[PDB]
Design an enzyme around this catalytic site. Sequence first.
Site, PDB file in Angstrom:
ATOM      1  N   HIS A 227     -51.627  29.624  43.554  1.00  0.00           N
ATOM      2  CA  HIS A 227     -51.550  29.971  44.973  1.00  0.00           C
ATOM      3  C   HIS A 227     -52.556  31.093  45.213  1.00  0.00           C
ATOM      4  CE1 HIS A 227     -48.608  30.236  48.642  1.00  0.00           C
ATOM      5  NE2 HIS A 227     -49.871  30.337  49.015  1.00  0.00           N
TER       6      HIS A 227
ATOM      7  N   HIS B  71     -55.515  32.279  48.114  1.00  0.00           N
ATOM      8  CA  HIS B  71     -56.251  32.132  49.364  1.00  0.00           C
ATOM      9  C   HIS B  71     -57.640  32.717  49.155  1.00  0.00           C
ATOM     10  CE1 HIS B  71     -52.722  31.098  52.022  1.00  0.00           C
ATOM     11  NE2 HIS B  71     -52.111  31.571  50.952  1.00  0.00           N
TER      12      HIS B  71
ATOM     13  N   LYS C 220     -52.597  20.690  49.773  1.00  0.00           N
ATOM     14  CA  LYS C 220     -51.675  21.708  50.263  1.00  0.00           C
ATOM     15  C   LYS C 220     -51.092  21.291  51.606  1.00  0.00           C
ATOM     16  CE  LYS C 220     -49.713  25.827  50.958  1.00  0.00           C
ATOM     17  NZ  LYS C 220     -50.490  27.095  51.086  1.00  0.00           N
TER      18      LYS C 220
ATOM     19  N   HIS D  33     -49.170  22.730  54.560  1.00  0.00           N
ATOM     20  CA  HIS D  33     -48.757  23.958  55.216  1.00  0.00           C
ATOM     21  C   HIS D  33     -48.220  23.653  56.607  1.00  0.00           C
ATOM     22  CE1 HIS D  33     -48.872  28.198  56.529  1.00  0.00           C
ATOM     23  NE2 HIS D  33     -48.922  28.477  55.239  1.00  0.00           N
TER      24      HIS D  33
ATOM     25  N   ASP E 199     -48.619  25.347  59.229  1.00  0.00           N
ATOM     26  CA  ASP E 199     -49.554  25.695  60.294  1.00  0.00           C
ATOM     27  C   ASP E 199     -50.334  24.475  60.765  1.00  0.00           C
ATOM     28  OD1 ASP E 199     -48.765  28.286  60.467  1.00  0.00           O
ATOM     29  OD2 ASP E 199     -50.649  29.168  59.773  1.00  0.00           O
TER      30      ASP E 199
ATOM     31  N   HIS F  87     -45.728  23.873  51.820  1.00  0.00           N
ATOM     32  CA  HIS F  87     -45.263  25.057  52.539  1.00  0.00           C
ATOM     33  C   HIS F  87     -44.446  24.503  53.702  1.00  0.00           C
ATOM     34  CE1 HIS F  87     -45.935  29.248  54.373  1.00  0.00           C
ATOM     35  NE2 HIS F  87     -45.275  28.556  55.284  1.00  0.00           N
TER      36      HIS F  87
ATOM     37  N   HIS G 186     -43.706  29.450  47.208  1.00  0.00           N
ATOM     38  CA  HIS G 186     -42.749  30.470  47.653  1.00  0.00           C
ATOM     39  C   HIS G 186     -41.404  29.843  48.009  1.00  0.00           C
ATOM     40  CE1 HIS G 186     -44.729  29.098  51.328  1.00  0.00           C
ATOM     41  NE2 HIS G 186     -45.847  29.642  50.880  1.00  0.00           N
TER      42      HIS G 186
ATOM     43  N   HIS H 110     -48.154  33.903  61.974  1.00  0.00           N
ATOM     44  CA  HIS H 110     -48.471  34.126  63.376  1.00  0.00           C
ATOM     45  C   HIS H 110     -47.890  35.473  63.777  1.00  0.00           C
ATOM     46  CE1 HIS H 110     -44.621  33.373  65.678  1.00  0.00           C
ATOM     47  NE2 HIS H 110     -44.277  32.983  64.464  1.00  0.00           N
TER      48      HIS H 110
ATOM     49  N   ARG I   4     -36.224  35.110  58.591  1.00  0.00           N
ATOM     50  CA  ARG I   4     -37.261  34.874  57.595  1.00  0.00           C
ATOM     51  C   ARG I   4     -37.067  35.732  56.348  1.00  0.00           C
ATOM     52  NH1 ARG I   4     -42.826  33.647  56.291  1.00  0.00           N
ATOM     53  NH2 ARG I   4     -42.999  32.196  58.052  1.00  0.00           N
TER      54      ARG I   4
ATOM     55  N   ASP J 223     -50.552  34.158  45.902  1.00  0.00           N
ATOM     56  CA  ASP J 223     -50.688  33.713  47.287  1.00  0.00           C
ATOM     57  C   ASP J 223     -51.469  34.817  48.015  1.00  0.00           C
ATOM     58  OD1 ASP J 223     -50.157  33.191  50.097  1.00  0.00           O
ATOM     59  OD2 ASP J 223     -48.105  33.952  49.858  1.00  0.00           O
TER      60      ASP J 223
END
Lengths: 122, 570, 100
Positions: free
Chosen positions: B137, B139, B220, B222, B224, B249, B275, B323, B339, B363
Site C-alpha cells: 500500500h 501512494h 485497486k 477504491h 473514490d 478499499h 486497512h 474528502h 469512521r 498507505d
Amino acid sequence: NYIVPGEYRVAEGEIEINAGREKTTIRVSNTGDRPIQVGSHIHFVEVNKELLFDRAEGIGRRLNIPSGTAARFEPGEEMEVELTELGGNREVFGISDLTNGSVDNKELILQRAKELGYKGVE
Amino acid sequence: MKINRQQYAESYGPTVGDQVRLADTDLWIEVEKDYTTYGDEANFGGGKVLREGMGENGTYTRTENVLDLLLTNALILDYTGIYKADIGVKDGYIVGIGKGGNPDIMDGVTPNMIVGTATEVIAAEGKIVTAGGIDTHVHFINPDQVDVALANGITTLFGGGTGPAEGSKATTVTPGPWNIEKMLKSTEGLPINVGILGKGHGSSIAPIMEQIDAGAAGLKIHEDWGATPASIDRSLTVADEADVQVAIHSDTLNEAGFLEDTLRAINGRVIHSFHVEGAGGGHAPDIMAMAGHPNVLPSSTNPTRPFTVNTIDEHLDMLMVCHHLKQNIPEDVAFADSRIRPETIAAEDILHDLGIISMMSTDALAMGRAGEMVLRTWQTADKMKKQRGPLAEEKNGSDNFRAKRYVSKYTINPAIAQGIAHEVGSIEEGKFADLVLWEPKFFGVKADRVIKGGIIAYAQIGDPSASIPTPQPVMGRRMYGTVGDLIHDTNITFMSKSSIQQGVPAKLGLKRRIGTVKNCRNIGKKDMKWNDVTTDIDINPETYEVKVDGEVLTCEPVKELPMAQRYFLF
Amino acid sequence: MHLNPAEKEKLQIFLASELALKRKARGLKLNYPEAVAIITSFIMEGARDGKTVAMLMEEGKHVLTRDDVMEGVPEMIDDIQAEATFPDGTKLVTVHNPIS
Ligand code: NI
Ligand code: NI
C-alpha cells in the site's frame, strides 16, 4: 530492571573450539629481529622461515586458537603452542608454495622446506 | 580450548541459546540453531581467517561454486526461524544459507558457498539480518519517499500514483495504459523494487484489462472512483484471467450496499483488503469482519498501529485525504464519528496479536507514514507482549514465536499476496538478495545497511570526507548500488505475465530486472505465515463492540512506547 | 564562503547541537542523537579553539554525564568520532564512552 538497547543475554557454560580433533603441543622460537604474528587458520609449516620449531609437526596442522585471533612471537623468545589438525579435503594451495596439494605428502613438503632453508627441518 | 559465551558473542555474535533484546523494546529473540562449526568461524580482516591459502580458496574460478558475496556470522531472523548462519550471494541471488569458507581446510562447508577471489565479504556478526520489507500500500506522491522507505528496511513498494495528483493522493491507482507506461519509465530512477497497480473500476472488461496488458502488476478498487459491485465483478474477473492481485478499499458510505453486498460481489474470490480495520477506509462500521474470511487477505495501515492516547486525536484531522470535512456540518461530523472508532482500533491491536490480520502496510502520504511500517509493527508487538503477555507457543522466556509472527506481517505475507514470493519476501535460497542489516540497538528504527541485488544500496554512514567512515554526521545515504546503470541491475520492476509476454519492457526500453507476478488467485488465508487464522468477528452496528468467539476485544492505549524520542530528534 | 561539502555537512551537526542545547536548557533528558550532536560539537569547538587532540579526547568524557541523558543512552554511545580542523590540519578525535 535497567534496560539497554540491543544487549545480549548469553547462556551458561563454555564452548570448545575444534572439537574432536587431534591436539599437539610444540615449542616455537623466533630467531629473527622483528615480531611475527601467526593467524589461526594458516598452515603452520608454511609460516615465516625465521620461526624455529619442528616443521614436521606443522604439516596438516594449524594454531588451535579462536578464529580470527593470532599468536605473537617476539624476537628471541619461545612459546608452547597447541596445534590442531586441518579439516575438509586436507589440501593446502598457495601461501609459501610448500604443499600445493594434499598435506599427506610429508617428505616432499620437508624436502621443499629444506630447499628454501626453513628453520627446523630435520 | 574453552571460550566463555560472552567473548564468543562479542567476537562472532550470539550463538545457540543466546538471547538478544530488540532495540529498546521488551522482546528477546533466542538463537535456535547455528550452521557454523566451532573453531572454524569465518571473519575478515588483517590476520583473520578469510585469506588465500586459508578460509578463502584461491584455486577455483567464479563458475566453480565461488560466491560473489558472503555475509559472515549473520543472525537470520525470518519466518523460517531465528538462527545463526552465513549467507552466500551469487549473481544477485541467494545461493546458500550455511557455512561458507574453504572446503580444502574447513569442515562442514556448504558445497556451493566456496569463498574465492571473486567473493566480497560483509561482516554481519553482531547484526540481525532480515528480508527486505514489502509495502503493498504505497501512494506514489513524493519521489523523496523512497529513501524514507529505505531507511526503515523496505525494499519493495507496491501501489499507484502519478505524483501529487488528487486521484493519486487519495487512491493507489495509476489510471490508464499511458499513465502506467509513464510511471514505468519513471521507475527506472527509483532505487527500490516497484509494483504498479491500475484502476480496477469500470463496467466493461476491456478498459480494465488494457491496463494489465500495459504493465500493471495489480488492481485497486477504491471508493473514490466508485466501489460498485459491477466494478468489483469486472476487476475480479480481469484479475482471475490475468493472475494478478486486487486490492479493495470498500465503500464507507454504504451507498450501493452494505458489507454483505460487497462479499456477494466478491463471491469467494481471492481479494486483498486494504486497512481492514476501517479508519483508513472501508464499510462503516463492520468492515473488519472481512478479516474473518478464508478468501480475504487482510492488511492494516500503520497510523493506528498501535493504540496510543494521541491516536484518536491525531486521526480526526487526517481524514481530509478522502474528502474534506467541516466541524459545524451535522452530516460530515457524523461521518467522522462513525469512521474513527476506538473500539475497532483496540480490537485491531489484538487481531494483529492473534494472527487474524496477516500483513502490515504504510498507505503512505495518504493517511500513512512511509518509513514507519517496521517501526510500528514492532511497537505493536512490544505493546501486545506487555499487555496480553506471552503467547501459548512461547517457551524458554523467548519471543521467537511472536517475532516470527510479526516479521511475516511485512516480509513474506505481502509477497505471497502480490504473488512475488518466488523472488522476494524471505531469506531463502534462490530468492533475490534483498537484505537489511540492523544493529540490535537500532533494530526496527534505523537500518544499518540495505543491500539490494547483492550490492549495498543504502547505508547509515558518516562523513564522506574523513579518514574512516564512522565519524559524524552518521546519516542515511545512497550507496554505489543506486549510481548509474547499476541502478538497473539491483532493482526489479514487477509486471503482469501478459505485459511481459507482449514485450512491454522492450517497447518501453526498461533496463531494470523484470519480475513476473504469478500465483495470486490460487492462494487464501491459510497461505499466510503464522497469520492463517480464520474466524467470525462480530462488530456491533450500535456500539462498535468487536467480539471474537464470544469474547470481547479491547485494550488500553499506551502513553509511552519504545522506539521513540530516545531515537528520533523529532 | 567557498564551502566544500564537509562544511555543508558539519553545519548540520552544529544546528543539531544547538537544538540539543536548547532542549537541555529547559531540563529535558537528552536522547542518543542530541547527546551525539552535543559531544561532536564540543569536539569541533575545542579543535577550533586550538586544543590538542589528546586534550579533546580527555575532556570529551565530561561534557555530558549519565544524569543528563535518558534511560539506556550512555550504553548506546560506545564511542564518538569527529573530524575537525585543528591548527595543524584536519584531524580525527575519538572519545571512548563519553558518558560515564
Ligand atoms: Ni484506502
Ligand atoms: Ni491508501
